[PDB]
Amino acid sequence: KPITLYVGADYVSAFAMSAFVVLKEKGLDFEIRTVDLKSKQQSLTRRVPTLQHDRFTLSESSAIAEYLDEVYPAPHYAAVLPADRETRALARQLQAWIRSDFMPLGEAAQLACEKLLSAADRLIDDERYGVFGDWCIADTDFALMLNRLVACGDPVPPKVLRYVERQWARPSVQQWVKQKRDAE
Amino acid sequence: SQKPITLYVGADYVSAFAMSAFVVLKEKGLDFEIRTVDLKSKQQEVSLTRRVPTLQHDRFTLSESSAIAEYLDEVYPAPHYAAVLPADRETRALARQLQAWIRSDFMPLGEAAQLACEKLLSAADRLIDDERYGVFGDWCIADTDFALMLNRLVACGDPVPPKVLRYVERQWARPSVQQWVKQKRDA
Ligand SMILES: N[C@@H](CCC(=O)N[C@@H](CS)C(=O)NCC(=O)O)C(=O)O
Numbered sequence: 399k400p401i402t403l404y405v406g407a408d409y410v411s412a413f414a415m416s417a418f419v420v421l422k423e424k425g426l427d428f429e430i431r432t433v434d435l436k437s438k439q440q441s442l443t444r445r446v447p448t449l450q451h452d453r454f455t456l457s458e459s460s461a462i463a464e465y466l467d468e469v470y471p472a473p474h475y476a477a478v479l480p481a482d483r484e485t486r487a488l489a490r491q492l493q494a495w496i497r498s499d500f501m502p503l504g505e506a507a508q509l510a511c512e513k514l515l516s517a518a519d520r521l522i523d524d525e526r527y528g529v530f531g532d533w534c535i536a537d538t539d540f541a542l543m544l545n546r547l548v549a550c551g552d553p554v555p556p557k558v559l560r561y562v563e564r565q566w567a568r569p570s571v572q573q574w575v576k577q578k579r580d581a582e
Numbered sequence: 583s584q585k586p587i588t589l590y591v592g593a594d595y596v597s598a599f600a601m602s603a604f605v606v607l608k609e610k611g612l613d614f615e616i617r618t619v620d621l622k623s624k625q626q627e628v629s630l631t632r633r634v635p636t637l638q639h640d641r642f643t644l645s646e647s648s649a650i651a652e653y654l655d656e657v658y659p660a661p662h663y664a665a666v667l668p669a670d671r672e673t674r675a676l677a678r679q680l681q682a683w684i685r686s687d688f689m690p691l692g693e694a695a696q697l698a699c700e701k702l703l704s705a706a707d708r709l710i711d712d713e714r715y716g717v718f719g720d721w722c723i724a725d726t727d728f729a730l731m732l733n734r735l736v737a738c739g740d741p742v743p744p745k746v747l748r749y750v751e752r753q754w755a756r757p758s759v760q761q762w763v764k765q766k767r768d769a
């Protein structure tokens with residue numbers, strides 16, 4: 399089915415990358431259309447990314463991953479969400495947390511940092527490729543968010559740095575960076 | 583006998599998101615204890631994010647109210663239990679969209695406030711119809727979330743179509759929400 403991914407003209411939204419990665423990790427074909435923010439976005443929410451699946455349209459990268467996982471499920475397709483029920487819960491928590499907290503990224507800023515660091519330290523481990531074993535779309539979201547530790551003030555454990563490096567190295571993510579470079 | 587369930591909420595019963603999780607449990611007819619978290623500044627053990635709500639299901643703990651809704655819907659599904667998410671795949675994706683949007687936009691609620699006000703009213707005008715009880719027809723948890731958020735229209739400066747006033751009223755009148763204002767009241 400014809401897919402079109404609506405994306406920011408400058409290719410910098412972590413949430414547009416998310417949706418892009420989902421489509422790539424699944425091996426699905428899609429056109430990219432761009433929305434020049436400042437201010438052409440004025441999709442129900444009037445934000446990017448927006449997904450066009452045949453006639454059906456959908457915004458919010460989290461909803462987008464959820465929906466493509468249902469329409470294109472394992473085994474025939476790669477699952478971007480965990481298969482285990484409560485691990486699926488945890489990836490959902492992680493996605494929704496990342497999307498609705500850490501706004502300060504200063505008392506407020508220092509607190510976000512302290513929560514982000516604390517979570518990195520408790521969720522990441524060298525023995526596991528993602529935080530829950532196999533990569534899921536939450537890993538890509540978490541890595542992207544963890545790049546803000548660079549602006550905080552407390553020492554970051556190397557296991558966290560390795561995780562961010564590991565996750566950025568994924569071919570799906572790398573196609574995004576190449577897509578971004580081809581302009582121009 | 584079902585697994586024990588506990589819900590962590592703010593001690594003031596104010597959170598729109600605490601209320602959301604509470605509504606899911608109540609719709610499904612599940613037993614649960616309620617435990618409270620103060621501020622300042624007790625959210626700083628059972629919660630990775632240090633925000634309310636947090637759900638404890640038997641031994642499993644889970645924060646983020648939308649993730650809670652998705653999880654309770656999987657553990658206690660239709661038809662054995664009332665569903666809080668739409669059955670239709672496309673419609674399910676739209677409720678998921680609405681939940682996330684609510685939880686990640688509308689911060690200004692000015693000029694960024696003006697834009698959020700505008701986006702809110704336009705969504706309300708497009709999704710609410712007197713012929714449909716919820717935005718999708720049958721009630722889902724997205725409707726409680728929407729109705730709570732729509733109460734911010736009161737602080738804006740555009741006239742509000744009575745059809746959305748009715749929706750908000752409709753949604754606040756569910757026995758599950760009322761159970762919440764009753765539990766809150768008892769404090
Ligand atoms: N939670 C949303 C985030 C969407 C979002 O924040 N999009 C930004 C990307 S910069 C945007 O469209 N900003 C333009 C605007 O809101 O006017 C998701 O994951 O899709």
Ligand SMILES: N[C@@H](CCC(=O)N[C@@H](CS)C(=O)NCC(=O)O)C(=O)O
Nearest residue numbers: 498597599633634635646647648685
């Ligand atoms: N997306 C989250 C939002 C949760 C949230 O914002 N909780 C507030 C209650 S108003 C909170 O815990 N504030 C304390 C804090 O963030 O420090 C959800 O649905 O659970």
